Every structure is written in C-alpha cells, then in structure tokens.
Design a protein around this ligand. Structure first.
Ligand SMILES: OC[C@H]1O[C@H](O[C@H]2[C@H](O)[C@@H](O)[C@@H](O[C@H]3[C@H](O)[C@@H](O)[C@H](O)O[C@@H]3CO)O[C@@H]2CO)[C@H](O)[C@@H](O)[C@@H]1O
Ligand code: CA
Length: 514
C-alpha cells in the first residue's frame, strides 16, 4: 500500500475530536449491515462487531434506522416502543452495543417515530375494536377506551384519512392505511411518549432522530411546532446534552421555522438529492457553478438565524429515502464527482451525516428497498456476515468495488471519504466555526470559505469543476496549507498566497493572526 500525497499531508495534523454534539454520524440500516448469526439478516450483534470499522472510518456517532418491533423490513411502523425487533436481537444485545459504543466515544442516536404507529400496535387494535363495537348512536367515550383519543377517528374523510374496514369510521393515516397517525396534542399520548423517552434514555441513548417532524399534527404547522417543542423539552428536561435532529422534508424557508422548537438540528434537505445544491453544482446545473454552493450555505444559515443563534446544522446529502450519491454521476469523472459530493457534504458546518455504503459508492435508486441494499463488505460469495438485503429490491448494476478492495486502493471513494473525515476531525472550526463565503474570491470553478471558532481560522477552497483553477487568497492574510483532498494523482498546491487546485479537489489552510 502506497499512500497518496493527500494521505501523507493530512496525517501530520493531530486529531482534535471534541466531546460535544458536533460529530460525524454514520446512518446504519441494521437489516442490511452485518449479520452475526448467519440468517442473512443484519442485527445489533453484527453492528457491534463492526464498530472498529466505523471508528476507523472516523465517525464518532451512529444513527440506526428503527430497531423496535415492526411487521415490515424497514421498521418505521412500530408495534412496541420498549423492545427490540426479534430480527435485530434483544434488549441485552442493545445494552452491549451501547457499552461498546461509549468505550469508543461513539454516541448512539435512535430513530424516534412518534408521528404514527403500526395499525398492529396494541393501542390501535384496541381503539379499532372499540370503535367497531359502538352502535349507530355512537360517539366514542375516552373513559371507556382512552386509546380512541390516541389516534384521530372521524365519520368524515378529511385529508389523509382511510376507512376502518367494515365500519362508517375513518382514521388519519397520512403515509398509508397501515400507519395510523398519533394525536400528539393528547396528554395521554404525551404521557406514553414520556415513558418511552425515559426507557431509552435510561439505557444510555445519546439522542434521537425525529421522523416526519413536519407531520406531527398533519397540516397545522402551529400545533406541529407546539408538539416538537413539547418533545424537545421532555427530552432535554431529562438529559440536557441530549441531541435531537428533525426530518423536515421541505425547502429551507420551511424547515428553518422548525428551529423555533429549540431542536438542535434540522436535516439540511436543500443540499440533498441529485437536484440539491451539491448535485446541481457537480453536474453543472447551478446558475453560478461552485459559487452557488457558497450562496446556498449563506442563504440557509441566514434563514435559520431568523429563528435561532444557537443550533447545529445537520448536513447529510443522501439517506435511506433517496437514490444513492453514486447514481447521480454518470460518464466522465463520475468517480471524481462522487468523491467531491461527500467533501461538500461532510465539510459543511454542524453535525455531519454519512449513509452506510456511500463511502464505497454503492448504487441503487429504483425503489426504496433498492436504496437499502446489503453493505458490500467483500466480493467473496460466502463471507461471514454478508446480508441478503430487502427481498423486493430491483436489479442494480454497481460501478465501484467492494470495501475490502477499496481499503487497498489509495484512490478509492472509501479512502477519499476517510481522508475527508480526518480533516474534519483535525479542525474543529470546520464544524463549529462561523461561516463566511468569500464571494469576491470565488467564481464558477472555485468556492472559498473562512471558518472561525474561538480565535482559530481555516480557509476551505473547493474545486468542484472539471477545470484546474488558481486563486489569490493573500487578501485573507498569511496562510499555511495544512490539508487537501485529491480525486486523482493531481494534487492541490499552495505558494505565496496563490492556491492551485486541479479538477475535483479541496485545499485547507490555517490563517496566522498576530
Ligand atoms: O405506501 C406508500 C409508500 O410506501 C413506501 O414508503 C415507505 C418507505 O419505504 C418506508 O421507509 C417508510 O418511510 C419512512 C421514511 O423512510 C422515514 O425517513 C420517514 O421519517 O418516515 C417515513 C414513514 O414512516 O414508510 C413508507 C410508507 O409505508 C414506498 O416505498 C413509497 O414509494 C410509497 O409512496
Ligand atoms: Ca442475523
């Protein structure tokens, strides 16, 4: 193994990992990750066995997709909020995972799905049976069945209601009939969620990913923010440094608003997907090339600032609900783009997220199942712990090698992402600093930022273009080049205030201030 120039350069910078809520988070689908008992389904024991891998990648947080009992493979429709799904193992396996995570200073985030339950959840079964029991006269009585007010039942088909089979009643189920929506205005419901947050916090959970936060109270954004506020306070009441990140799948003008709840993070969705800011810039669909990435960072930061001066952005770029990054880039320098997309994701301010498999450029988009294929550990047929993945996934042609092979390749996507995360772990200002887009020095080819945290300043220079570019950054002050990312043998250079970046590369400087 012969290390690239970037590897040698970046290694000379000491890790500076701060134990707070600005981390690098690996999002795992337990189902498709690593199988410990040989049934082809991934499990908690399997995840535990692969913590050396995740830690070696440089991630110091894990978010698992839902781990509680569910009739589906994906497990977003929950039947029991205080156990583990039998396919994943037991509560004892969860306890061991937490212990092993904390020993490695890795924090654990669980997917917290309270906008709906499964229609097989006992609360709904009981409400449904009760509703069906009522004579024509009717009008439910929550003293006879309190669960009737845990969900929204009506004789009227408003928006997102489905029929309760064999009756004249309907119930709210925005996503699908098998996912009835919880009434989060119910004090009884809030009482139940209280017990649930106590349960998971008491087993050493560090935070929550809040699913579907903008659908907490259907179309009523006021009640939704009230609901989120209640939840954020319920959690922080019990553990002050508990971390919470909300999924608000919408534009930034909308998801900025949810920061009024006091939540730490909202996922930064306008930077996600093929047609998000990162994707558009790399595929040449942006009005101002590289500088569009600058403008977008500033516009979103400025929007959030309307609501809070005290937050952690959640850049993620891709997740289990979207086509994998590698599928966004085809033809000439697709690999270069695939790498740089993750530089543009992971070197953003706040708490950065990496979806499992993105570090080896896994492909898959045709349907949701196909976005959640088995982690490609190895090419070997019968390697221990390989997962079969979801049963209804479409055919998908991969374009990059398996992980074992990528580790051995100094110019693999894996080694690039690994290098990216090392830069982030070396310079706390990248995640925590105030962000300044140096617009006067940026153009369609290069994008320049200064990051300032507690009197330390760094300069980030991205070249997400197919063209070599030079920039005079001497106006920013006296700088030293400390880190870089290269997508080919061509490496960034820096001399006497002039930076030269080849196509698809990054250069990091420290400013010296006297
Ligand atoms: O029935 C209509 C839709 O059904 C399918 O969508 C599934 C998703 O595959 C599944 O992951 C889950 O979506 C959750 C999503 O992953 C999560 O990030 C978000 O916070 O909550 C979602 C709901 O819990 O559930 C839906 C609904 O069953 C199908 O793939 C989709 O194309 C259909 O439109
Ligand atoms: Ca298994």
């Amino acid at each position: 193994y012969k290390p690239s120039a970037m590897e040698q350069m970046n290694a000379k910078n000491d890790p500076n990992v701060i134990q707070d809520n600005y981390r690098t988070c690996y999002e795992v689908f337990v189902y498709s990750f690593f199988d410990s008992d040989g049934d082809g389904i991934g499990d908690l024991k399997g995840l535990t066995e692969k913590l050396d891998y995740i830690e070696g990648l440089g991630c110091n947080e894990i978010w698992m997709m839902p781990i509680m009992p569910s009739p589906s493979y994906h497990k977003y429709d929950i039947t029991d909020y205080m156990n583990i799904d039998k396919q994943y193992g037991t509560l004892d396996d969860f306890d061991a995972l937490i212990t092993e995570c904390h020993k490695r200073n890795i924090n654990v985030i669980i997917d917290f799905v309270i906008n709906h339950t499964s229609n097989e959840h006992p609360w709904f079964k009981a409400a449904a049976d009760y509703i069906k029991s009522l004579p024509d006269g009717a009008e439910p009585d929550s003293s006879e069945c309190p669960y009737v007010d845990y969900y929204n039942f009506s004789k009227t088909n408003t928006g997102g209601y489905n029929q309760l089979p064999g009756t004249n009643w309907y119930y709210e189920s925005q996503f699908v009939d098998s996912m009835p929506d919880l009434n989060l205005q119910s004090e009884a419901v809030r009482g139940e969620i209280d017990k649930v947050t106590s349960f998971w916090l008491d087993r050493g959970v560090d935070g929550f990913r809040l699913a579907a936060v903008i659908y907490y109270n259907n179309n009523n954004q006021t009640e939704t923010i009230d609901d989120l506020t209640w939840l954020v306070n319920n959690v922080k009441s019990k553990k002050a440094d508990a971390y919470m990140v909300g999924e608000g799948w919408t534009t930034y003008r909308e998801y900025a608003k949810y920061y009024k709840s006091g939540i730490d993070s909202m996922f930064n969705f306008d930077f996600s997907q093929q047609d998000g800011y990162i994707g558009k810039v790399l595929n040449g669909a942006a009005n101002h090339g590289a500088s569009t990435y600058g403008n977008a960072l500033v516009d979103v930061e400025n929007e959030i600032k309307k609501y809070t001066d005290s937050y952690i952005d959640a850049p993620f770029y891709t997740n289990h609900d979207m086509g994998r990054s590698a599928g966004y880039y085809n033809g000439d320098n697709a690999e270069e783009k695939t790498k740089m997309a993750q530089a543009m994701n992971l070197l953003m301010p706040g708490n950065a997220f990496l979806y499992y498999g993105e570090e080896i450029g896994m492909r898959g988009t045709a349907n949701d199942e196909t976005k959640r294929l088995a982690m490609r550990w190895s090419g070997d047929s019968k390697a221990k712990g390989m997962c079969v993945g979801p049963q209804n996934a479409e055919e998908t042609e991969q374009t990059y090698d398996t992980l074992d092979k990528q580790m051995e390749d100094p110019y693999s996507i894996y080694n690039f992402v690994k290098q990216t995360i090392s830069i982030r772990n070396a310079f706390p200002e990248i995640a925590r600093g105030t962000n300044t887009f140096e617009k006067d020095l940026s153009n369609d080819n290069v994008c320049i930022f200064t990051r300032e945290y507690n009197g330390e300043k760094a300069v980030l220079i991205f070249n997400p273009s197919k063209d070599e570019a030079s920039v005079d950054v001497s106006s920013l002050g006296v700088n030293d080049a400390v880190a870089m990312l290269q997508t080919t043998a061509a490496a960034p250079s820096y001399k006497d205030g002039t930076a030269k970046l080849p196509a698809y590369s990054v250069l990091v400087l420290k400013e010296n201030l006297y």
